[PDB]
């Protein structure tokens, strides 16, 4: 979970 | 195969600044700033997407070393599985990568971890690109060590579909 949305 | 985030975002521009809030005492500055350089030309080099460094005020990928808690919601876990976070293009935290300190950052090396590979990898997400199935691809979503890296088909076709190739 490296790929973050905000 | 290659893949993006939900929304596409992308970045609008194609000159596109960074900046080093902070440094991994585990490697020389030189060492980093070559390995951030390298990082981002390795997405330059097929792409007509330039990346500039600053010494000061609020850069598009604002770059940070930091563990655990470090004040954006999504917490780093200790030494191993997550080796760094990128937001997906866009304003404010958005571009951002962090990377986590708990691990031990190399170059040119089986130990550790390449600061090179991870930078890259989590960049690529900066620019909207998501992982890749692919086990030689960059975008892996697993960590390997390769003494001579290339950039997959499969990178480089989806950042192209993204961006463009190189007009050079
Ligand atoms: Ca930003
Ligand atoms: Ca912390
Ligand atoms: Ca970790
Ligand atoms: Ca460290
Ligand atoms: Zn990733
Ligand atoms: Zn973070």
Redesign the interface.
């Given at each position: 979970n490296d790929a973050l949305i905000x | 195969m290659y893949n993006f985030?939900p929304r596409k975002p992308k970045w609008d521009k194609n000159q596109i600044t960074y900046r080093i809030i902070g440094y991994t005492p585990d490697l020389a500055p030189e060492t980093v700033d070559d390995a951030f350089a390298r990082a981002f030309q390795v997405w330059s080099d097929v792409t007509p997407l330039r990346f500039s460094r600053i010494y000061d005020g609020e850069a598009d990928i604002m770059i940070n070393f930091g563990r655990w808690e470090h004040g954006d919601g999504?917490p780093f876990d200790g030494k191993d599985g997550?080796?760094?976070?990128?937001?997906?293009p866009?304003t404010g935290?958005?571009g951002d990568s962090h990377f986590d300190d708990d691990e031990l950052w190399t170059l040119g090396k089986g130990v550790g971890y390449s600061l090179f590979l991870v930078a890259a990898?989590?960049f690529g997400?900066a620019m909207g690109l998501?992982?890749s199935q692919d086990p030689g691809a960059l975008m892996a979503?697993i960590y390997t060590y390769t003494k001579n890296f290339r950039l997959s088909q499969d990178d480089i076709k989806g950042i192209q579909e993204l961006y463009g190739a190189s007009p050079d």
């Amino acid at each position: 979970n490296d790929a973050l949305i905000x | 195969m290659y893949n993006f985030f939900p929304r596409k975002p992308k970045w609008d521009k194609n000159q596109i600044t960074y900046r080093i809030i902070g440094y991994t005492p585990d490697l020389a500055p030189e060492t980093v700033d070559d390995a951030f350089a390298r990082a981002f030309q390795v997405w330059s080099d097929v792409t007509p997407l330039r990346f500039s460094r600053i010494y000061d005020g609020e850069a598009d990928i604002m770059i940070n070393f930091g563990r655990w808690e470090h004040g954006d919601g999504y917490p780093f876990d200790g030494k191993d599985g997550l080796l760094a976070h990128a937001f997906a293009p866009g304003t404010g935290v958005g571009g951002d990568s962090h990377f986590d300190d708990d691990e031990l950052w190399t170059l040119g090396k089986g130990v550790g971890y390449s600061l090179f590979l991870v930078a890259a990898h989590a960049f690529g997400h900066a620019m909207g690109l998501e992982h890749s199935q692919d086990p030689g691809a960059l975008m892996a979503p697993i960590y390997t060590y390769t003494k001579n890296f290339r950039l997959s088909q499969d990178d480089i076709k989806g950042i192209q579909e993204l961006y463009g190739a190189s007009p050079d």
